[PDB]
Amino acid sequence: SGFRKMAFPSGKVEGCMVQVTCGTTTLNGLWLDDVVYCPRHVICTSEDMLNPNYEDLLIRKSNHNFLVQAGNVQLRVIGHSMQNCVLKLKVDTANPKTPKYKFVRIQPGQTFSVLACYNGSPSGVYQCAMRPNFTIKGSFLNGSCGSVGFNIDYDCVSFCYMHHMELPTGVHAGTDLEGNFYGPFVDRQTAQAAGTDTTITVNVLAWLYAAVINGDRWFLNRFTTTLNDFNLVAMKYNYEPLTQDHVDILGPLSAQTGIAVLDMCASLKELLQNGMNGRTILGSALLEDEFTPFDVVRQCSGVT
Amino acid sequence: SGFRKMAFPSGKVEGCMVQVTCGTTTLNGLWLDDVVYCPRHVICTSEDMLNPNYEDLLIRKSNHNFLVQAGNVQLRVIGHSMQNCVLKLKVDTANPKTPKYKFVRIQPGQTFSVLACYNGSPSGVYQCAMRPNFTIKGSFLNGSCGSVGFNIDYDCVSFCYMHHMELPTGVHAGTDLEGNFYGPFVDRQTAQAAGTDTTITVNVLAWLYAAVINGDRWFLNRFTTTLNDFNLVAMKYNYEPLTQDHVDILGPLSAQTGIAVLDMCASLKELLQNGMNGRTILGSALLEDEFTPFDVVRQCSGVT
Numbered sequence: 001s002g003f004r005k006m007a008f009p010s011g012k013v014e015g016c017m018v019q020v021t022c023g024t025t026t027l028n029g030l031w032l033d034d035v036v037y038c039p040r041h042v043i044c045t046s047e048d049m050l051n052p053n054y055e056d057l058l059i060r061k062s063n064h065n066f067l068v069q070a071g072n073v074q075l076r077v078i079g080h081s082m083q084n085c086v087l088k089l090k091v092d093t094a095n096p097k098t099p100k101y102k103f104v105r106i107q108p109g110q111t112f113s114v115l116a117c118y119n120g121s122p123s124g125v126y127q128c129a130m131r132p133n134f135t136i137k138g139s140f141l142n143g144s145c146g147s148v149g150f151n152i153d154y155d156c157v158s159f160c161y162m163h164h165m166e167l168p169t170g171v172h173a174g175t176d177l178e179g180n181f182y183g184p185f186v187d188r189q190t191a192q193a194a195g196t197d198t199t200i201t202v203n204v205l206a207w208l209y210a211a212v213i214n215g216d217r218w219f220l221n222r223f224t225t226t227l228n229d230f231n232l233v234a235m236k237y238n239y240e241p242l243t244q245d246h247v248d249i250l251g252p253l254s255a256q257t258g259i260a261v262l263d264m265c266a267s268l269k270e271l272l273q274n275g276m277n278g279r280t281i282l283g284s285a286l287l288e289d290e291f292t293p294f295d296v297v298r299q300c301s302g303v304t
Numbered sequence: 305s306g307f308r309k310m311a312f313p314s315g316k317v318e319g320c321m322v323q324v325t326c327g328t329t330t331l332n333g334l335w336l337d338d339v340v341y342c343p344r345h346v347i348c349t350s351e352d353m354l355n356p357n358y359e360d361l362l363i364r365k366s367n368h369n370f371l372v373q374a375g376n377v378q379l380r381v382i383g384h385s386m387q388n389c390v391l392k393l394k395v396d397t398a399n400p401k402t403p404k405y406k407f408v409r410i411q412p413g414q415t416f417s418v419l420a421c422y423n424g425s426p427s428g429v430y431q432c433a434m435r436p437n438f439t440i441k442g443s444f445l446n447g448s449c450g451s452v453g454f455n456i457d458y459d460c461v462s463f464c465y466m467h468h469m470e471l472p473t474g475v476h477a478g479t480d481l482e483g484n485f486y487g488p489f490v491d492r493q494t495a496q497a498a499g500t501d502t503t504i505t506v507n508v509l510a511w512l513y514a515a516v517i518n519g520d521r522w523f524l525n526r527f528t529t530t531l532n533d534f535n536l537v538a539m540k541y542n543y544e545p546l547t548q549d550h551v552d553i554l555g556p557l558s559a560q561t562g563i564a565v566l567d568m569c570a571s572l573k574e575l576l577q578n579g580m581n582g583r584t585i586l587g588s589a590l591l592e593d594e595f596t597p598f599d600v601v602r603q604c605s606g607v608t
């Protein structure tokens with residue numbers, strides 16, 4: 001019993017963190033096999049960030065200009081290439097600590113753990129959701145770029161995010177491991193609009209099932225609703241519209257608790273319309289949307 | 305910018321997790337040097353838990369009855385001993401992955417990370433506070449016993465907690481690494497009173513400073529208070545009384561933001577008396593008490 005915002009164990013990712021320095025700029029890199037991946041803005045000075053011509057800036061750089069240090073050992077750079085907004089530094093030594101891994105592009109609403117790093121050293125780990133508007137509400141300071149987001153399935157780390165930027169609004173933006181930004185963002189020191197965000201409805205429902213499993217039941221009611229009726233409420237409260245695909249993914253939680261998905265939607269509808277009335281659910285005074293239905297099943301069953 | 309409930313990177317602790325089996329009971333053990341530490345209730349059957357005579361139960365056990373497996377390798381047990389509520393299994397091989405470590409007894413109100421494990425395998429990591437009543441509101445299922453709580457200072461892991469029990473109320477209880485319970489709890493399947501809990505005032509203040517640092521300022525006001533006046537409010541709202549020692553630990557955050565500790569106490573007093581009025585602070589709709597002043601400084605500065 002009990003339900004926590006749990007991150008994956010970060011060990012396999014800690015073994016991959018390196019420091020990348022180019023000129024006077026330092027950030028984090030991810031060393032997998034004989035390649036070190038890092039944000040391409042490592043080649044910029046703070047001044048260059050206003051409108052960097054990355055192709056031109058990278059042309060002035062040679063392999064020996066990228067200083068890569070894994071803790072205390074120095075890696076020999078034998079090649080460099082820019083793919084989208086990431087740099088790939090080929091090194092002469094494969095990382096002995098390379099876990100089984102994949103590079104994945106996650107969907108908005110999905111969750112992952114972040115291993116926040118500075119100077120190639122891990123500082124902490126936390127669980128994030130990729131917002132529907134492709135931003136993340138993380139915890140990053142200057143120097144944290146190159147820190148990555150990931151999920152783990154037994155012995156396989158799926159890397160889904162690399163940190164690049166903090167928008168003027170304090171929210172975070174980054175790329176997949178092929179250097180493609182999530183959202184409309186560009187790696188430039190310019191004010192950039194993040195789209196209108198919404199609350200991840202399927203995740204709030206999943207978390208309401210986790211609450212019922214763990215003892216918090218006060219919000220259950222004698223009502224039901226339809227996808228159409230619920231979606232009118234979701235529209236008014238800026239929630240993502242619920243689809244049958246969302247209802248389908250909630251299947252296992254609905255089967256375990258015996259609470260029909262639309263009956264849980266009616267509890268959520270009443271919570272949206274009336275608030276929590278000064279009460280809490282799983283230690284929170286708001287409706288939590290950073291737990292997917294898979295996260296709830298994993299934590300509630302003890303998946304390792 | 306941004307502020308998250310951050311756990312320490314769990315890598316150094318993952319390297320210490322083993323599975324301990326005695327008879328039909330399996331739980332987690334912590335392998336440091338040539339000793340494996342685990343809850344002594346590994347020697348009980350579910351039936352024995354009603355009122356176990358641990359000395360008698362352990363006398364029926366021999367070294368070869370404790371099966372210790374680190375992933376896929378089997379450890380040879382050459383000695384066993386019970387210290388308080390923990391068992392110490394001497395093995396013939398020192399853990400090569402043993403980090404620099406210490407065993408510490410933490411104080412209530414202090415925080416730590418938990419590496420939740422099942423069958424010796426890590427499932428996730430989360431940040432906890434030890435409640436003033438010595439319980440923890442964690443996330444643990446049967447089989448998670450032996451999972452540990454810890455803090456890290458550069459390369460030194462200070463182990464402070466080992467999980468033993470879930471009270472009938474769903475809160476968690478455990479011991480320090482010498483097997484002494486935090487609180488009045490005994491390792492027996494009996495209903496046990498947890499003392500009256502309080503909200504950790506110094507931590508809420510520390511978190512209010514983190515909010516100001518990261519942009520959330522709406523709760524700041526034109527008022528001030530005294531320790532005496534604030535403590536009358538803390539009494540009414542079941543908060544721990546604030547002392548000069550608490551004010552002293554908030555010194556660095558008060559110096560950085562330029563907000564006097566008693567001025568922040570007046571903001572907290574108004575929040576206690578008026579609620580949040582449907583607003584949030586650092587993504588929370590309640591006053592958070594699981595961040596110590598040290599945690600706030602560490603995260604706000606990027607300590608690795």
Ligand SMILES: CNCC[C@H](C(=O)Nc1cccnc1)c1ccccc1
Nearest residue numbers: 044045140141142145165166188189
């Ligand atoms: C040339 N180095 C500049 C790095 C700097 C950067 O890492 N900033 C930042 C700040 C806080 C959290 N996360 C990221 C940057 C990156 C992208 C666009 C503008 C500025």
Ligand SMILES: CNCC[C@H](C(=O)Nc1cccnc1)c1ccccc1
Nearest residue numbers: 348349444445446449469470492493
């Ligand atoms: C003989 N094995 C019983 C283990 C069992 C136990 O681990 N239970 C438990 C359940 C959920 C979370 N955390 C812990 C136990 C321990 C202490 C007192 C009563 C029962």
